[PDB]
Amino acid sequence: TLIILEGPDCCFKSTVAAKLSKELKYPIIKGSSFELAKSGNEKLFEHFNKLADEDNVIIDRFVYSNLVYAKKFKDYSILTERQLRFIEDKIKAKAKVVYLHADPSVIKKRLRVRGDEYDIDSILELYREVMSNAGLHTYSWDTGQWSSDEIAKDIIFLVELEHHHHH
Amino acid sequence: TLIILEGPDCCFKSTVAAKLSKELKYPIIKGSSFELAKSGNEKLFEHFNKLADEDNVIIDRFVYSNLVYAKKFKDYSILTERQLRFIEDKIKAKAKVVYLHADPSVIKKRLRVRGDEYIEGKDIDSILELYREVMSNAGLHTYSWDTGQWSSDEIAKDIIFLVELEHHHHH
Ligand SMILES: Nc1nc2c(ncn2[C@@H]2O[C@H](COP(=O)(O)OP(=O)(O)O)[C@@H](OP(=O)(O)O)[C@H]2O)c(=O)[nH]1
Ligand SMILES: Nc1nc2c(ncn2[C@@H]2O[C@H](COP(=O)(O)OP(=O)(O)O)[C@@H](OP(=O)(O)O)[C@H]2O)c(=O)[nH]1
Ligand SMILES: [Mg+2]
Ligand SMILES: [Mg+2]
């Protein structure tokens, strides 16, 4: 199964991915790449289609993140409706979309390095809209209430069930 | 005089500003605001024009950074050639434009230590290049300092020297 982790920064995405990989033994792959989106739609889509054709992997940031940041950065290709829906229909039977987030203030506090770097409110709103428009069943966790460890365990427990395996 | 600090991130801009302010006793004001940039050109120009009326203050990032970041973010207003030219003429007799930079390697290092992980090499390069180009094309005389070999103390001292030497400069 494809475990897709989406969401704004500082929301335990990489840590979750790490825990899930150590347990499920699924390789971790970065999906939504900046420079990739700037290389054009064709390369963008072909990349997602390559991953979409795979299974038993953990994708840190994927199609939904592209729809978010494409509205923020210039020269940042975005997937067309056709492309998005094409990929969803191809992974619908094997994907698990996990949305990780936190309150705008919780994230802000998490990036205490310089008030200038801080935007976040606008990104969260976009994720919500994008996720709310997803054509796949999704699972969301408020990283502000649940720990990265409890989230990983839930996802691991879940995957083990569908695979009809014990714990 | 009006001190303007420009340049990419982690180049001692805010530190220099704080040191210059302690000495010269000039208030410190951030010029380029991400929120203001997304509120439209009219709002953008209006704000820059008001700052252009100020004097004896330090502007941490101004019209030049606007030109840089407008080419990187969407729904991010940019000054027009005419407006930029208008602001320059308006403060040419009191402005001191400072450009603080550093090699890409140095910048990337400061980002790592600052805590980033997502070191966007290519992005950082394009931004650094934009700054050089926009600064070279500045309609106002500019002073540059390679923060890779010059400390914020040494820089502030140099700038303090220039402000003092001003009542000796003509034309
Ligand atoms: N409070 C808490 N934080 C956790 C937990 N799991 C991971 N984190 C921390 O939160 C930070 C962002 O983790 P990461 O998953 O890379 O964020 P991301 O969603 O942007 O990818 C990390 O901190 P650092 O970069 O500062 O080390 C990681 O250690 C957890 O259960 N609780
Ligand atoms: N090596 C050195 N570093 C200096 C010197 N001056 C300022 N710095 C450091 O470099 C960091 C970025 O400085 P700052 O002026 O905030 O950068 P900016 O231009 O993005 O505003 C700071 O570190 P922190 O945020 O980590 O504290 C500041 O302390 C100096 O002469 N030498
Ligand atoms: Mg991550
Ligand atoms: Mg600063």
Swiss-Prot record, chain B:
UniProt GO molecular function: dTMP kinase activity
GO cellular component terms, semicolon-separated: cytoplasm; cytosol
GO biological process per UniProt: dTDP biosynthetic process; dTTP biosynthetic process; dUDP biosynthetic process
Protein name listed in UniProt: SPbeta prophage-derived uncharacterized protein YorR
Protein's organism: Bacillus subtilis (strain 168)
Upper taxonomic lineage: Bacteria, Bacillati, Bacillota, Bacilli, Bacillales
Gene name, Swiss-Prot/TrEMBL: yorR
